[PDB]
Amino acid sequence: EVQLVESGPGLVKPSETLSLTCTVSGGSISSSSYYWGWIRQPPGKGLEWIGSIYYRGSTYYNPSLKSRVTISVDTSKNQFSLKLSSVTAADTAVYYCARHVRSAYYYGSGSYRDEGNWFDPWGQGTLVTVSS
Amino acid sequence: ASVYAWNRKRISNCVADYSVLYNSASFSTFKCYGVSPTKLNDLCFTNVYADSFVIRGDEVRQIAPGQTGKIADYNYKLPDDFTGCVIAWNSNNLDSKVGGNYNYLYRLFRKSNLKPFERDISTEIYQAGSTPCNGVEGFNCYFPLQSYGFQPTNGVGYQPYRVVVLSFELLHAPATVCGPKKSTNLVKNKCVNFNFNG
Amino acid sequence: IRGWIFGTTLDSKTQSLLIVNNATNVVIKVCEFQFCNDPFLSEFRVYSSANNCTFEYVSQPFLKNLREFVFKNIDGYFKIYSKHTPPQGFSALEPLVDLPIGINITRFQTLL
Amino acid sequence: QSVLTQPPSVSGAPGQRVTISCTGTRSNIGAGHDVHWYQQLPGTAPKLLIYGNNNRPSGVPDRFSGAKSGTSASLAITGLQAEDEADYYCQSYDRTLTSYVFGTGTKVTVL
Ligand SMILES: *[C@@H]1O[C@H](CO)[C@@H](O)[C@H](O)[C@H]1NC(C)=O
Ligand SMILES: *[C@@H]1O[C@H](CO)[C@@H](O)[C@H](O)[C@H]1NC(C)=O
């Protein structure tokens, strides 16, 4: 009942700004402790965490990409936007957005584990290529 | 009132009839510990306290002497030596609402357990993670639990229930809360046994 | 002569009786009123506090003119005896009310 | 650095015991915040298989177990079945990078 959908341009030139949009259903980005994150998967490699945003507008980004990644929310449309500046061909990859249900597993310690571990639901993903 | 901030009312110096309510057969839960519930308004107490709040059906079993769980540890606690009564009835028709009724909150965090029946007076924030919060509710430092989501199409465990806990205080004071004086008709010109109000 | 102030400490620390004659009605409380060095009584500066307050009652006025009263505490029931006679002579004092208060009265500073 | 290390593939015949290792650093698998395991088809939403080193979410067969020690972790599949042909990822929070780092992942095939 949870749905995520990534949208954006398939080709972007290096140094430009990439804007991806995640439209979701089954939850609201306004719920207490709920989170919305962005994760990347480079060609034939593992998943790589990019960033996260909270119902309260708090947000984190991967330190090596912190200055170039930006995540924003639109509660009215239940959407999350990710902007990446000074892109390079190294950023080519499949991007996924994901839902984080309030805190952690609430049953078991009372969600007293930062964020449990991660999320569960996933979107279809969008492939973004950076080349000139 | 919501369960975290339940409403206590003192009652004294009045006439009460319990068997209208206890025999009304209108409540889903009516359990009396200590005193017999069956038509025992033949007693007089100093004060009578009525604590009203709202929970869900799944949690009704937790509002009882020496019970443990979210509500009991964090919202409303009763002592094991409870000489009183608990009444509760399903209020889905009165406390639910289309699109949900989110007016009832419950406390989800506390350093300790609740010392027999207290309520959400001091309603601060508590650290639920590693280091100081120092402000705005955030990472490893948040609010207690949310609202209750009392939609009318909920499961019974998730439906609103109204709860009233009656406690009977008998201190070293003139007791004034008694119930009825079952008078009878009088007769004349015949040897009878009489009871002329005392 | 309008009423009295019965209590142990006559402050917010303990409940006390402000038996008053409010000149349209008689007003009685058992609330925790605070002390007044000399509460005057057309203004009233006796009811300094109503620290929480637990009981209030009103009634008809009592009404050259000799009023006699007896105030007794007995087993927590506080009784009151009275009469009104138009001070040499003899009479008797009928009861008016018992109040099941249950408080410790050791000072009864009259109101003025 | 950014990735937990797993062997890129692990295999066995149906009914065998197949284990997947997961090599981290002091900041994640070592002194971090416990390692979880994932099991989902490539490109599709993962599903939590093991939480908190050794907990199982409901729906995960009891034959999946996790273990951690020091800076290394393992997943044990105790009786490899045809359903166990998937990718498996480990994951853990890295306190030094302050990021949640997934493993590079292991594909199992029931030969
Ligand atoms: C006492 O009398 C005054 C005016 O005579 C009136 O305003 C007030 O309501 C009365 N009762 C009180 C003060 O309890
Ligand atoms: C009044 O004082 C006596 C002295 O022992 C005490 O026993 C009694 O309980 C007191 N009354 C009240 C109402 O506290």
Residue numbers in the entry:
A (entry chain E): 1 to 132
B (entry chain A): 348 to 545
C (entry chain B): 101 to 141, 155 to 176, 187 to 209, 217 to 242
D (entry chain D): 1 to 111
What does the article say, verbatim?
Here, by comprehensive structural analyses and extensive functional validation, we defined a core epitope avoiding viral escape. On the basis of this concept, we further identified an ultrapotent core epitope targeting antibody, 1F, which precisely binds to the core epitope and is tolerated to most of circulating mutations. We hypothetically defined this region as a “core epitope” and supposed that binding residue mutations outside of this core might result in an immune escape without compromising the infectious of viruses since these mutations dismissed the binding ability of antibodies but not ACE2.
After cryo-EM data collection and processing, we solved the cryo-EM structure of 1F Fab in complex with the S-trimer at an overall resolution of 3.8 Å. A single 1F Fab binding to RBD at the open state was observed. Superimposition of the 1F–S complex structure over the ACE2-RBD complex structure revealed clashes between the ACE2 and 1F. ACE2 competition using ELISA showed that 1F could block RBD-ACE2 binding efficiently, with an IC50 value of 0.69 μg/mL, consistent with the SPR result. Furthermore, 1F neutralized SARS-CoV-2 effeciently, with the IC50 values of 46.36 and 18 ng/mL against lentivirus-vectored SARS-CoV-2 pseudovirus and authentic virus, respectively.
